[model samples]
Target: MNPKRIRALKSGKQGDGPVVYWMSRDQRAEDNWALLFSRAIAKEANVPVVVVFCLTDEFLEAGIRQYEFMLKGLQELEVSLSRKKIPSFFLRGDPGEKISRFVKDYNAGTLVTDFSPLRIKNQWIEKVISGISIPFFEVDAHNVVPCWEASQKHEYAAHTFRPKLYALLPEFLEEFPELEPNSVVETLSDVLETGVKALLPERALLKNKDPLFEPWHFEPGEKAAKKVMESFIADRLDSYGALRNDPTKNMLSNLSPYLHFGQISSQRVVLEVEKAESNPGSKKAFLDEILIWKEISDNFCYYNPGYDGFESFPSWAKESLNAHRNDVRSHIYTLEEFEAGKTHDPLWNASQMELLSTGKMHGYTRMYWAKKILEWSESPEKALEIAICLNDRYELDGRDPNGYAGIAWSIGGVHDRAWGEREVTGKIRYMSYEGCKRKFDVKLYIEKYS
Candidate 1:
């Protein structure tokens, strides 16, 4: 922990009861640093540990689909925590206010929470930290290496951040601490016994609500996440490095959604990949992608404050976008038009429509899809906004560090360097339908969507 007082806006005397581990950024039970940290502190003080999750309806990119995925995961979280005797409370309202109220009601002596660099998440955390008198500790559980520990400045790109992560990887890559079963069964059952239905608000209307949930919702929880991980290891790990980019291969680990929602921890994924084989090359490559690329995104958000919006781009990227700000688009479409897959490029349309229909898209196609939106939009700013908005709304992985960084890479070259100058894109690198066609069977994708 940093020696400085956590920029507390409001201070009060520490409450007298169990410590509350507010489950926000990292949502899973196994391999969770924040949850384990909370339990350790509670055990030291001879008090109960309660897990809390606040459900807010206004997350920028979330809608029914994302919420459905999150809620299913959360429901499982509640059950898992229950078995450990730690009570999991799900409250519906503004996150900051709800958290503050819970802290006060529970008489929590201290608060422990996971860290998030996104403006929205940080803003809420700041509010709760300031309003409460108790000492609130934030743990950097989401990243493979702690964001603050990785770097003090905004890195230029993956190349710059990679070394910093590698230097610290050995120390941070150690095994996760075990969570002892405290089993507060009596207290937990009693808490649920009292009417708390008013606390769990109606399901959120996330931008990309899954249609499958309407008929048959998928299972949510750490167990399911592990099962998915195991299945991927058994079926896809061998070809993952080679075929992940091939849109038709389906060889990529479908872990983004789980990672995005914090349903699964990065450490768990890293450990699982290590267990796959003793092949040093494959292990190194897989871990590098998962931890290095992923940690760089967190490092980017922490160092570059305006990461979620327009301000985080490089000077070249900003200049390039502004230079083409008014460039005439051959075809401009509303969000509805783009969402409904009405674009001229069948491949891009299919990609967009796939995300709309199923809250997931192939990683390579996502970049191409975003670049095409930039090309077809009325202006670069509008294009960035539309593409980011659609992704945040529909993609299960929206509103994440990766989502923000990915959008910036596609639309404004945040971590990417400039390429040769071209129309509309100026010096920023551009992707085309032809490039995607060269790599994957675009017509097949379009036909599948159709």
Candidate 2:
């Protein structure tokens, strides 16, 4: 549709047989640009559209919880696509290799896929483009404004990138194209195979999953994602701005994981927020977070290559953290202690436990949660390692752009201004358990998680 906005990474003439839209970054059937893009191509050729998803076991920070969430969401997507007469296939093994093989097997003339900026995802795209003879098109569906078009160079902070993002919002935020579902479905039941059983009973489904490291029971799917969004707007949106930073309130939008997994699109979320009849304050708060905060994350990733690591730190932040590397921690929690929620600080202990048992923690508490890691660990590097490791191992949203940027900001001040100097955190702003208690009912958070 938007030719300038989308790019054909590789191109081949339209051919006979079904066209495959590899569903990876963007998961949902509706409001999916890649899916819509593929359908348009298939329509011209009078061929059916087939969707393929590769389930890989080598993904990091993704254990049973992550897999379960994704599987359930994909299962829902399969059903929805089936209704449209589009066959959805789930294959196991390497994504880059699997996609290429499917193209050859199906004799697909061309392949269309959504865009992702992450290195791992990009590698797959590169391999597929190089390996396959067919034209491989990559559509920029992740960002409201295309990341490369938004800024050629990396943005330093939200303030620097806000105007750039705003300039493109008016044009890019226009209505999404309507999808024309295919009437023909092609079955690949004979070729589709994987070691992991697709049909796992609910009772045995991720039940024995570890709580301390992989706790989560969230049923995935576009249906569940939309349900969560509806509930957030209906009740919690009113308090989103005011209570977002209060760890005990749990008032923030819990949509990051769904967004990260492409279970929901940013456009879908933005459209719903616009339709909300809530007060101006509520709408502004929610929109600012969804648009502004998320834009900052993309901008950060564009600017900082190693955003998730310690190297992304500002000079002042690095110096400050380095200075306090040897500071005496009231209680040093080993990785095990931290993982087990056995820390001395009840608040920190509770936060860790929440992440361990629920795969989520209050957004506000996340700041203090990470800051304490910097304070209690042996060094800034160790702190970053523990924080990122724990986050990836537990949170559904871990290893995403949001997680990377959030961790960078908390531990290294990547997108934040310098705060008063502290022992371990230095010029980086400090967050303490005492401060949290004074601001919100920290005990309630502790009690809830414990």
Candidate 3:
């Protein structure tokens, strides 16, 4: 691993104990730079290595389905780590306090953690940094090119950020070393339980009582994630460039849910895709979406703290929106009505139902869905709130940088240029049912999803 990927947050001497990796954003057992870095430090220090994950029942906007998927994945990860002779711990409550207590109890020599640009994750990191006195480091295991290395300022658009990422891709995008079985052994204190069972005892009860407690369409875990990637490459890559934008054709990679939960590494996806046989256009298109577009979202969130709000919109976008704020609306709906999928447009309703049922919406339709929310809501601010709320509540890939950036682009014009003026959306781009018909078989998509 490049030492540049690891950022030291606090300076201190290494203690004479195990190295604790506080697994946060990245959940997988293999292909994790933070975990590998922790193990390497432990090997050099001749001490044991441990992995700790913090769980809470009240993560923002996450519902039963999201929690169940994560817990199931973590259950598999615990077994994978144990087989490698490394112990795993499940910590509950405030991650800062719980993880800090765990490190102190174990007399850990160093603390390592994965990176996230979300505000909540940053706040958690701040609290943990203040609470721990050990040598602390954070690794950007989530991005193929670390977010900090990509750019230090908020990028004006993809055009500006694309060159920077492409320049550094040669240095950062490389194969990951295999995580070998550990030789050192250590016993953990009983205060921290060792698996998902200790973190979520309500799983069994929820499975029986809750109607929503069922297996996801996409299975959870690192092993399952690898299978999904292979299937996409073999079955879908050929037509990806041709049909990716058509909602009726399911040529998409379907890797967002796995990527959102950190069940797989984006770098691993790029590596496999590069080796796959495909037309030059298809290969380049797929790589652009996964590498450049996805990483741009992380860059936006890292530099702009208000990524999820209307305030994050570009200055010209804000001015245009405000200029037409008082324009009359033909229709308006409350958030409750929107969530129930009671929209007047059949296509929009189908998109909502698809998200509700499958925990995913077609990428093309997602843009239309969010733009309509802005069109129908009373104000631009309300539209942004409703769009984000519905997205975070229902989508399996909610609460991610990609989702935030996509929504902002659709409603608030972040990373987007001004278009012709409209009533509710102002200079923001607009999408209509007529446009949908021109692009794809609207009736077929509505029938299938609705």
The local distance difference test score of each candidate is 0.75, 0.75, 0.85
Name the better of 2 and 3 by lDDT.
3
List TM-scores for all candidates, in order: 0.89, 0.89, 0.93
Q: Rank the candidates by TM-score, best first.
A: 3, 2, 1
lDDT of 1 by residue, 262-316 (tens): 8888888887787677346556667777887787888777777777566778898
By the TM-score metric, which is better: model 2 or model 3? 3
Per-model clash counts, in order, read 15, 3, 0
Relative to the true structure, candidate 3 has a C-alpha RMSD (angstroms) of 3.8
lDDT of 2 at 391: 88
**lDDT, model 3:** 0.85
Top candidate (lDDT): 3
Q: What is the lDDT of residue 72 in candidate 3?
A: 76
Number of backbone clashes in candidate 1: 15
Report the lDDT of model 2 for residue 124. Answer: 77
Least accurate stretch of 10 residues (summed lDDT) in model 3? 185-194
